[PDB]
Design an enzyme around this catalytic site. Structure first.
Site, PDB file in Angstrom:
ATOM      1  CG  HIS B  62      39.781  42.404  40.428  1.00 42.48           C
ATOM      2  ND1 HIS B  62      38.704  41.606  40.810  1.00 42.48           N
ATOM      3  CD2 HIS B  62      40.391  41.743  39.413  1.00 42.48           C
ATOM      4  CE1 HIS B  62      38.659  40.539  40.021  1.00 42.48           C
ATOM      5  NE2 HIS B  62      39.701  40.555  39.174  1.00 42.48           N
ATOM      6  CG  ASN B 135      37.494  36.527  39.322  1.00 43.17           C
ATOM      7  OD1 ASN B 135      37.825  37.421  40.075  1.00 43.17           O
ATOM      8  ND2 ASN B 135      38.005  36.403  38.105  1.00 43.17           N
ATOM      9  CE1 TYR B 349      47.407  37.637  39.761  1.00 43.12           C
ATOM     10  CE2 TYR B 349      46.366  38.777  41.552  1.00 43.12           C
ATOM     11  CZ  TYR B 349      46.244  38.038  40.386  1.00 43.12           C
ATOM     12  OH  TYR B 349      45.034  37.678  39.841  1.00 43.12           O
TER      13      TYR B 349
HETATM   14  C1  HDD Z   1      48.675  37.856  33.938  1.00 42.41           C
HETATM   15  C2  HDD Z   1      47.914  38.642  34.650  1.00 42.41           C
HETATM   16  C3  HDD Z   1      46.641  38.245  35.300  1.00 42.41           C
HETATM   17  C4  HDD Z   1      45.755  37.152  35.018  1.00 42.41           C
HETATM   18  C5  HDD Z   1      45.862  36.123  33.932  1.00 42.41           C
HETATM   19  C6  HDD Z   1      44.786  37.292  36.078  1.00 42.41           C
HETATM   20  N1  HDD Z   1      44.982  38.332  36.916  1.00 42.41           N
HETATM   21 FE1  HDD Z   1      44.003  38.786  38.637  1.00 42.41          FE
HETATM   22  N2  HDD Z   1      45.133  40.436  38.827  1.00 42.41           N
HETATM   23  C7  HDD Z   1      46.264  40.717  38.130  1.00 42.41           C
HETATM   24  C8  HDD Z   1      46.748  40.060  37.067  1.00 42.41           C
HETATM   25  C9  HDD Z   1      46.128  38.906  36.473  1.00 42.41           C
HETATM   26  C10 HDD Z   1      47.047  41.907  38.712  1.00 42.41           C
HETATM   27  C11 HDD Z   1      47.501  42.928  37.679  1.00 42.41           C
HETATM   28  O1  HDD Z   1      48.365  41.462  39.149  1.00 42.41           O
HETATM   29  C12 HDD Z   1      46.216  42.386  39.892  1.00 42.41           C
HETATM   30  C13 HDD Z   1      45.950  43.863  40.075  1.00 42.41           C
HETATM   31  C14 HDD Z   1      46.117  44.196  41.546  1.00 42.41           C
HETATM   32  C15 HDD Z   1      46.818  43.084  42.135  1.00 42.41           C
HETATM   33  O2  HDD Z   1      47.272  43.012  43.293  1.00 42.41           O
HETATM   34  O3  HDD Z   1      46.949  42.105  41.185  1.00 42.41           O
HETATM   35  C16 HDD Z   1      45.018  41.394  39.794  1.00 42.41           C
HETATM   36  C17 HDD Z   1      44.015  41.473  40.700  1.00 42.41           C
HETATM   37  C18 HDD Z   1      42.971  40.485  40.930  1.00 42.41           C
HETATM   38  C19 HDD Z   1      42.059  40.537  42.065  1.00 42.41           C
HETATM   39  C20 HDD Z   1      41.886  41.578  43.102  1.00 42.41           C
HETATM   40  C21 HDD Z   1      42.553  41.222  44.404  1.00 42.41           C
HETATM   41  C22 HDD Z   1      42.194  42.318  45.378  1.00 42.41           C
HETATM   42  O4  HDD Z   1      41.020  42.403  45.815  1.00 42.41           O
HETATM   43  O5  HDD Z   1      43.086  43.136  45.699  1.00 42.41           O
HETATM   44  C23 HDD Z   1      41.285  39.335  41.915  1.00 42.41           C
HETATM   45  C24 HDD Z   1      40.201  38.873  42.796  1.00 42.41           C
HETATM   46  C25 HDD Z   1      41.875  38.680  40.755  1.00 42.41           C
HETATM   47  N3  HDD Z   1      42.834  39.398  40.156  1.00 42.41           N
HETATM   48  C26 HDD Z   1      41.415  37.392  40.323  1.00 42.41           C
HETATM   49  C27 HDD Z   1      41.830  36.694  39.157  1.00 42.41           C
HETATM   50  C28 HDD Z   1      41.300  35.388  38.818  1.00 42.41           C
HETATM   51  C29 HDD Z   1      40.253  34.569  39.459  1.00 42.41           C
HETATM   52  C30 HDD Z   1      41.979  35.119  37.591  1.00 42.41           C
HETATM   53  C31 HDD Z   1      41.899  33.949  36.713  1.00 42.41           C
HETATM   54  C32 HDD Z   1      41.574  32.809  37.155  1.00 42.41           C
HETATM   55  C33 HDD Z   1      42.860  36.235  37.358  1.00 42.41           C
HETATM   56  N4  HDD Z   1      42.764  37.153  38.319  1.00 42.41           N
HETATM   57  C34 HDD Z   1      43.759  36.321  36.227  1.00 42.41           C
END
Ligand code: HDD
Ligand code: HDD
Ligand SMILES: [Ca+2]
Ligand SMILES: [Ca+2]
Ligand SMILES: [Ca+2]
Ligand SMILES: [Ca+2]
Ligand SMILES: [Ca+2]
Ligand SMILES: [Ca+2]
Lengths: 678, 678
Positions: B62, B135, B349
């Site tokens: 993202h 999402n 996160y």
């Molecule tokens: C195990 C890790 C993992 C999994 C399974 C997911 N994500 Fe995630 N996501 C992350 C690990 C992550 C992250 C690496 O932790 C991020 C990167 C930046 C942040 O702050 O968190 C992230 C960012 C991130 C953002 C951006 C937030 C922003 O605008 O700053 C969104 C909207 C989502 N994710 C949504 C989802 C949704 C709807 C998921 C499943 C239902 C999902 N993610 C599964």
């Protein structure tokens, strides 16, 4: 190679943790089959912690770019002009890594943005790493490094909304250009085809600054670095670059990768202009001023050696993303000058690696390591990968017998500051009056372009300044353009419905210089790697046979052939759905496919009018285009493409068609298809 | 204004250092007017150090996105289902910040890539920050968080050359999808118009996971979060999205920013599906499985409140780039479920903000600060901003009288785990067999699209799979698509010249569900903010008169009107050189400009054919198009557009023209202009 020792092979074996314990990584450990995940799942946390921490800060500038390995080979023993070891023998080879880039865009921004481009070269010499951190344009926008954040804030996206990406086409940039007239020379280059080069291989590299060559006897001369492309110079046109940004953001990095993989690794002659210290002000400008070129008529190029890029990285992150260039990576036989832009760069490139690497041991990354022994008393720091055996790391010492020993002009091949250098005068925050002509050399550059190249540059300024909202900024822009050329000010003003200021002839002249024009640089010296799209059909067995004919003929000459049809099959590379004229340097329709070009033609397998749109776009963008097979007549009529047009080919014979068409590929662009101001 | 305490005004005053010493920042300090720069120039080094360290790591996913401030308003007192304070009274208002995003691309990649999109909402509640990190697609690719790096490595660029940017159209992604069948549901959503939304305002938000609502009595219910757009659902078409990526990489962020500035701040109903704990396996799938939706026929949406975005950020970096969302940001009244994807997110996160911020005090950044007091014994760490008065930060203590006090279900409005939750069984790294149907729900989705929607999804798969080099991967992809739909497999296989495998009907069915179709969700409820391009000419004062009269009539209804002509002047917003059909939702030609649509038309002021290409592209992409003034033949004939076509308008009367055209803007797309497989 410090990279060889660090290569990791995962072609066999069982999954392990980072400490060698065999594990799995596909299912979390849970309290029952529908239960919550356990904190004791170290397999989960080590993998996800790694993922969570994969990213590092992008470069503050030149964030978008791509690199390759290769070799520099000296043409001679250059001892007579420099002590530099990498230049001290005929045939001496030195490994290199080069990264090419844009300047303003972030990571993921398009290769084909209009911008200045980086050309950064590391020589892993036998006397240390030597970097020439250059650009594809020989002059820079500003005269003092302290202004770099002002320039870069102004061109980068507006900071309330971060719009627009990878573009000068906004108020803040043109505000800065119109308020800081030093910017005119680089702005003229950026608004020329040099802003949208056809590829990294079709552009030159420049050191920009005056540097010094220093001999072992202590004498010095002033030099400029010029890396001259063996592939020739070529540009996109803007309306093509805008589509290509969307259709293939990776175009320049793929072009480079493919050229290396096909055995067509790009080459440059590494050249210098060499002049005496006494000529610092002899050419009508100051050699300390990085907004000025030395016209080749005053100082010819000397060819020092060949740079060839011939090997792609193994891991883009490890090698390309982590390479950390510095103009402070200097070797004995080279010295700085008092160019205030260069002076401040030396600080910036050492400091910024702390941001990128997160700690001080960035020179220990394999891509940054040298190819000689390191002997110094640098110690500790986060990420320390060495185990130092010298337990007395201070000078002067007796407990390590005085090692490491000082290196200088008379010991250990030390670097030394050119001993003829001096400084005199007050400690001042003052600009040299010798720097004050911001307009003559922009005029020289503009004068040196062909009429259609002048029109392209006017059209680029008309495009960008028409997007400036502030009527006031637009008036200030015309004031500065008018100081370079009244004609440019008048032609740009016409597009934005303002009146140009009256002529101010203070800096007007008619002089020209060789080697700055793209359109004027003649046919390309090689067409190898250039892309030919053959528009065919599965409808007609004739059409695939004609395509296969043309393919054999064109592939013999080293062209990259793409046969396009409705659907993939034997002999077809690409569907109409994925094809675009931005993907080709020339387009050929086999006459068997004529029915696909009718206004009534429709398929669920590609967008309405796609085949014809490829041909018309290719023609309108100045590319060689033709129809091969006998009913060349129609198709040319569907496209409103005139059969008597230069760069328009119509032949029943494949042999005759290809002979003609390949001359078109060398011409590269048919500039008669672009309208000029009267 | 919610962060007004942190704002810094620079509209007046002399330049200072960061410690308030007045300085200058335009010329370096030198030893003489043409001398070297001095190390004692602190003005230079503080400014360049800051510049050198501006960048922070982009988000691991993202990375490309944009945010805005707003307000959430509860429709009711929801005590009867949740203790959540922000939901405890009719009309109760809570400030929000939302960021929207793509998933795969880096910073500066295009908004209009085909991708999943983020919709992350922070509620600054009076009982703590609560984040719903959602999402625009309600189902996720994978069933266990430990697989997240596998998915993301496979969809991000190939790691030798980092190609391709912001795209699933490459071998690795389709290798992953075909080897990991759980991916089929999200894959079908991403290949639909949900992969290329018209704007952030024209897409929904989904929590994806089952969560719990927990009452103050300890009882719980299972919920799904649905944020339902009050703007309507709308998509781009792919062949528009590709051009838009190049013409305007900032399209979605620009659309959002402009909607807020014009007083058209986008709105969503924040809704839940609410089912009993006993219904976890009642709907023919497991509510812990994040690859499944609850069909609305089984559980209707309850509207909880209104989300409105109405204030753009002041500084993008400080607010949008720095906002650090976490599903661990939970409040009393909400709890987790044993969804193994959600479970692992809770770790990810909290950890990943250490990478982005470089230290542990990221919740002190203004954008991340809560709007209520903080009382805890967290201390020290890099960047510590607080000066803690409690010198006994341990529990249990007497020397601070036992403060802070423990909060729990019975005291201090503590968070508490839903007390009916249990676990039982072996500690296992095993997948629940209740997760094993990877194909029924993708077929449910596909069946619920209209015929041209199904064609668009087939065509997206044909596009991407045709770019997969490996014939092995393409065959494996057809094996998986065939388990969802034999017809999809046959139609996709046709484009890549493979045979589809024999029908396998295990998972085939004809069931449909409401509310997943874009094409089927009827005309848009409002046309406010939609973009009308009026193609005029300066060569006829009557053409500019027609354009002015159309502007007045269209602006009255809240449409954003762009008058296009050869050059800017009073009443003309853009030049033809900068105009493109991707900048409009509809295109109007004034009949006084008919001469610019002739195949003969040429000008140095814009590319050959640009006026007609804007009209043709808009028609071929499905937009309402027409000619206002009564002479429509010359324009419509040049464009090969039939006057009787649906969404093609020809009227003399400006009032009649606008009434008809506005119905077309609500229809938004004329799907009769796209060919269907037989
Ligand atoms: C195990 C890790 C993992 C999994 C399974 C997911 N994500 Fe995630 N996501 C992350 C690990 C992550 C992250 C690496 O932790 C991020 C990167 C930046 C942040 O702050 O968190 C992230 C960012 C991130 C953002 C951006 C937030 C922003 O605008 O700053 C969104 C909207 C989502 N994710 C949504 C989802 C949704 C709807 C998921 C499943 C239902 C999902 N993610 C599964
Ligand atoms: C005072 C600051 C300053 C000034 C005046 C310049 N630069 Fe620079 N440049 C940087 C500060 C900087 C930097 C912030 O230090 C970067 C960012 C990443 C890095 O390693 O250094 C950089 C990166 C950078 C790169 C990318 C290297 C790579 O591919 O990793 C190139 C090619 C250049 N610059 C070239 C130039 C040229 C030819 C300049 C003027 C003649 C110039 N820069 C002036
Ligand atoms: Ca701006
Ligand atoms: Ca050019
Ligand atoms: Ca750090
Ligand atoms: Ca010295
Ligand atoms: Ca791949
Ligand atoms: Ca759609």
């Amino acid at each position: 190679s410090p990279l060889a020792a660090y290569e990791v092979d995962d072609s066999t074996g069982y999954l392990t943790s980072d400490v060698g314990g065999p594990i799995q990584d596909q299912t979390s450990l849970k309290a029952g089959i529908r239960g919550p995940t356990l904190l004791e799942d170290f397999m989960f946390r080590q993998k996800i912690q790694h993922f969570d921490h994969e990213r590092v800060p992008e470069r503050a500038v030149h964030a978008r770019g791509a690199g390759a390995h290769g070799t520099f080979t000296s043409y001679a023993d250059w001892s007579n002009i420099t002590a530099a070891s990498f230049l001290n023998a005929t045939g001496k080879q030195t490994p290199v890594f080069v990264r090419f880039s844009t300047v303003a865009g972030s990571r993921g921004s398009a290769d084909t943005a209009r911008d200045v481009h980086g050309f950064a070269t590391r020589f892993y010499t036998d006397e240390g790493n030597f970097d020439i951190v250059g650009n594809n344009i020989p002059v820079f926008f500003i005269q003092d490094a302290i202004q770099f954040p002002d320039l870069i804030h102004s061109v980068k996206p507006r900071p309330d909304n971060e719009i627009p990406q990878a573009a000068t086409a906004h108020d803040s940039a043109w505000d800065f250009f119109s308020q800081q007239p030093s910017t005119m020379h680089t702005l003229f280059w950026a608004m020329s085809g040099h802003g949208i080069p056809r590829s990294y291989r079709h552009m030159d590299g420049f050191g920009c600054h005056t540097f010094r060559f220093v001999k072992d006897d202590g004498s010095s001369k002033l030099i400029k670095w010029h890396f001259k492309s063996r592939q020739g110079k070529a540009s996109l046109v803007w309306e093509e670059a805008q589509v290509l940004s969307g259709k293939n953001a990776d175009f320049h990095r793929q072009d480079l990768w493919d050229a290396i993989e096909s055995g067509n690794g790009p080459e440059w002659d590494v050249c210098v202009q060499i002049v005496d210290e006494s000529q610092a002000q002899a050419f009508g400008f100051d050699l300390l001023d990085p907004t000025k070129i030395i016209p080749e008529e005053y100082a010819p190029l000397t060819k020092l050696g060949l740079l060839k890029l011939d090997r792609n990285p193994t891991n883009y992150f490890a090698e390309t993303e982590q390479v950390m260039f510095q103009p402070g990576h200097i070797v004995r036989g080279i010295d700085f000058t008092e160019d205030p832009l260069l002076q401040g760069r030396l600080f910036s490139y050492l400091d910024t690696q702390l941001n990128r690497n997160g700690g001080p041991n960035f020179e220990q990354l394999p891509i940054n390591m040298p190819r000689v022994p390191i002997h110094n008393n640098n110690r500790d720091g986060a990420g320390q990968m060495f185990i130092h055996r010298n337990k007395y790391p201070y000078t002067p010492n007796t407990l390590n017998s005085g090692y490491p020993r000082q290196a200088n002009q008379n010991a250990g091949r030390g670097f030394f500051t050119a001993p003829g250098r001096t400084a005199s005068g007050a400690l001042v925050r003052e600009v040299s009056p010798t720097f004050n002509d911001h307009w003559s050399q922009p005029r020289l550059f503009f004068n040196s372009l062909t009429p259609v190249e002048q029109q392209f540059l006017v059209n680029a300024m008309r495009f960008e300044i028409s997007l400036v909202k502030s009527e006031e900024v637009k008036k200030n822009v015309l004031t500065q353009l008018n100081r370079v050329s009244h004609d440019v000010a008048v032609r740009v003003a016409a597009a934005i419905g303002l009146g140009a200021p009256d002529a101010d002839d203070t800096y007007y002249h008619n002089n020209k210089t060789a080697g700055v024009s793209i359109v004027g640089s003649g046919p390309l010296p090689t067409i190898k790697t250039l892309r030919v799209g053959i528009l065919a059909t599965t409808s007609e067995s004739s059409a695939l046979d004609q395509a296969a004919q043309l393919r054999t003929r064109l592939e013999k000459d080293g062209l990259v052939v793409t046969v396009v049809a409705e659907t993939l099959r034997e002999g077809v590379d690409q569907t109409y759905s994925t094809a675009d004229a931005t993907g080709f340097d020339g387009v050929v329709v086999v006459d068997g496919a004529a029915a696909l070009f009718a206004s009534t033609a429709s398929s669920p397998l590609f967008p309405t009018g796609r085949p014809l749109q490829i041909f018309v776009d290719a023609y309108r963008w100045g590319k060689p285009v033709g129809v091969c097979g006998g009913k060349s007549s129609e198709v040319l009529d569907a496209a409103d493409v005139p059969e008597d047009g230069d760069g328009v080919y119509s032949e029943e014979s494949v042999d005759m068609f290809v002979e003609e068409f390949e001359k078109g590929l060398a011409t590269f662009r048919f500039t008669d298809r672009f309208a000029l101001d009267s």
